């Protein structure tokens, strides 16, 4: 099916997918506050699918919050960040799939968006 | 300087100049209160945000306005902004450098921590 939004999390310390990381997605509401939208835990391949459907994923401002702090603490590593947040606008401009990827280290993270048809 | 921000542009191979940065501190009531703000200089650095006295233990949020920066260059970027949220000075005062490397659809952030 078409998954309009997927998240992929990788671990730069161990060279593997970041498994069981909690991810919360929010949608910016009218009052300019964040309403919970979807959530889950990355799988064994460091992925999280089925967050939403095309009908529900309308244009708007979304926040993807990745709980990196609990992931490093589970490994016994003291991390710097409270969490990693990706805030973006979803735009209808031809059909699209969004992949938010995050690469984690204790004191650093990178995030990239891969938008495909 | 207990807190300094450095922003680089990965598309042009230069410092990211005139990027607005807003810092907030989590207040008692779980809300973010405005702590300091500024613009990156010609070398892509932002100094003088706070003093050791004012920079108490707490959860801080450094929000870098990356969208305006790319928009002023003619590029429509993916992210609304880059946010770095962290606990500071929970074991005594430190000097924190938050560095950000920017691209239109990607950003990376690192912290370099120094003991006074």
From Swiss-Prot, chain B:
GO terms for cellular component: azurophil granule lumen; extracellular exosome; extracellular region; extracellular space; protein-containing complex. The keyword Glycoprotein applies. Coiled coil: none annotated. GO terms for biological process: negative regulation of glomerular filtration; phototransduction, visible light; purine nucleobase metabolic process; retinoid metabolic process. Changing residue 101 to M: Loss of tetramerization. GO terms for molecular function: hormone activity; hormone binding; identical protein binding; molecular sequestering activity; protein-containing complex binding. The modification Phosphoserine is found at residue 43. Detected in serum and cerebrospinal fluid (at protein level). Highly expressed in choroid plexus epithelial cells. Detected in retina pigment epithelium and liver. Glycans are attached at residue 89. L-thyroxine binds at residues 6, 45, 108. Not glycosylated under normal conditions. Following unfolding, caused for example by variant AMYLD1 'Gly-38', the cryptic Asn-89 site is exposed and glycosylated by STT3B-containing OST complex, leading to its degradation by the ER-associated degradation (ERAD) pathway. Sulfonation of the reactive cysteine Cys-1 enhances the stability of the native conformation of TTR, avoiding misassembly of the protein leading to amyloid formation. Keywords: Amyloid, Amyloidosis, Cytoplasm, Disease variant, Gamma-carboxyglutamic acid, Glycoprotein, Hormone, Neuropathy, Phosphoprotein, Secreted, Signal, Sulfation, Thyroid hormone, Transport. Changing residue 9 to E: In AMYLD1; amyloid polyneuropathy. The modification Sulfocysteine is found at residue 1. The modification 4-carboxyglutamate is found at residue 33. Changing residue 64 to V: In AMYLD1; amyloid polyneuropathy. Changing residue 36 to D: In AMYLD1; amyloid cardiomyopathy. Changing residue 11 to I: In AMYLD1; late-onset amyloid polyneuropathy with carpal tunnel syndrome. Changing residue 50 to K: In AMYLD1; amyloid cardiomyopathy. The keyword Cytoplasm applies. Belongs to the transthyretin family. It is linked to Amyloidosis, hereditary systemic 1: A form of hereditary systemic amyloidosis, a disorder characterized by amyloid deposition in multiple tissues resulting in a wide clinical spectrum. AMYLD1 is an autosomal dominant form due to transthyretin amyloid deposition. Protein fibrils can form in different tissues leading to amyloid polyneuropathies, amyloidotic cardiomyopathy, carpal tunnel syndrome, systemic senile amyloidosis. The disease includes leptomeningeal amyloidosis that is characterized by primary involvement of the central nervous system. Hyperthyroxinemia, dystransthyretinemic: A condition characterized by elevation of total and free thyroxine in healthy, euthyroid persons without detectable binding protein abnormalities. Each monomer has two 4-stranded beta sheets and the shape of a prolate ellipsoid. Antiparallel beta-sheet interactions link monomers into dimers. A short loop from each monomer forms the main dimer-dimer interaction. These two pairs of loops separate the opposed, convex beta-sheets of the dimers to form an internal channel. Tetramer dissociation and partial unfolding leads to the formation of aggregates and amyloid fibrils. Small molecules that occupy at least one of the thyroid hormone binding sites stabilize the tetramer, and thereby stabilize the native state and protect against misfolding and the formation of amyloid fibrils. Homotetramer. Dimer of dimers. In the homotetramer, subunits assemble around a central channel that can accommodate two ligand molecules. Interacts with RBP4. This is Transthyretin. It comes from Homo sapiens. The lineage of its organism: Eukaryota, Metazoa, Chordata, Craniata, Vertebrata. The gene is TTR. The chain holds residues 30 to 145 of 147 of the full protein.
């Amino acid at each position: 099916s078409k998954c309009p939004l997927m998240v992929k999390v990788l671990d730069a310390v161990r060279g593997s997918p970041a498994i069981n990381v909690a991810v919360h997605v929010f949608r910016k509401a009218a009052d300019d506050t964040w309403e919970p939208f979807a959530s889950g835990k990355t799988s064994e391949s460091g992925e999280l699918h089925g967050l939403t459907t095309e009908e529900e994923f309308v244009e708007g401002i979304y926040k993807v919050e990745i709980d990196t702090k609990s992931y490093w603490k589970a490994l016994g590593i003291s991390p710097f960040h409270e969490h990693a947040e990706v805030v973006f606008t979803a735009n209808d401009s031809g059909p699209r799939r969004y992949t938010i990827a995050a690469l984690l280290s204790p004191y650093s993270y990178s995030t990239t968006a891969v938008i495909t048809n």
